[PDB]
């Protein structure tokens, strides 16, 4: 899920 890539990680 998005909490991996810092481009999405702020709020998966």
Swiss-Prot record:
Keywords annotated in UniProt: Acetylcholine receptor inhibiting toxin, Amidation, Cleavage on pair of basic residues, Disulfide bond, Ion channel impairing toxin, Neurotoxin, Postsynaptic neurotoxin, Secreted, Toxin
Site (Important for binding to human alpha-7 nAChR): 5-7, 9-10
Localization per record: Secreted
Disulfide cross-links: 2-8, 2-12, 3-8, 3-12
PTM characteristics: Not hydroxylated. Hydroxylation improves its folding but impairs its activity against target receptors.
Tissues expressing the protein: Expressed by the venom duct.
GO molecular function: acetylcholine receptor inhibitor activity; ion channel regulator activity; toxin activity
Domain of life of the source: Eukaryota
Coiled coil (UniProt feature): none
Main location: secreted
Reported impact of residue 6 to R: Loss of ability to compete with alpha-bungarotoxin
Function of the protein: Alpha-conotoxins act on postsynaptic membranes, they bind to the nicotinic acetylcholine receptors (nAChR) and thus inhibit them. This toxin blocks neuronal alpha-3-beta-2/CHRNA3-CHRNB2 (human and rat), alpha-7/CHRNA7 (human and rat), and alpha-3-beta-4/CHRNA3-CHRNB4 (human) nAChRs. Acts voltage-independently. Competes with alpha-bungarotoxin for binding to the receptor. Binds to a different site than alpha-conotoxin ImII. Is highly active against the neuromuscular receptor in frog. Also exhibits inhibition of D.melanogaster alpha-7 nAChRs.
Note: This toxin is a substrate for a multienzyme complex that regulates its folding and assembly. This complex is composed of protein-disulfide isomerase (PDI), peptidyl-prolyl cis-trans isomerase (PPI) and immunoglobulin-binding protein (BiP). PDI catalyzes the oxidation and reduction of disulfide bonds. Oxidative folding rates are further increased in the presence of PPI with the maximum effect observed in the presence of both enzymes. In contrast, BiP is only observed to assist folding in the presence of microsomes, suggesting that additional cofactors are involved. Negative results: does not inhibit alpha-2-beta-2, alpha-4-beta-2, alpha-2-beta-4, alpha-3-beta-4, and alpha-4-beta-4 subunits. Also has no effect on muscle nAChRs alpha-1-beta-1-delta-epsilon.
Domain notes: The cysteine framework is I (CC-C-C). Alpha4/3 pattern.
Family recorded in the similarity comment: Belongs to the conotoxin A superfamily.
Name used for this protein in its record: Alpha-conotoxin ImI
Native species: Conus imperialis
């Amino acid at each position: 899920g998005c909490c991996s890539d810092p481009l999405c990680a702020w709020r998966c």
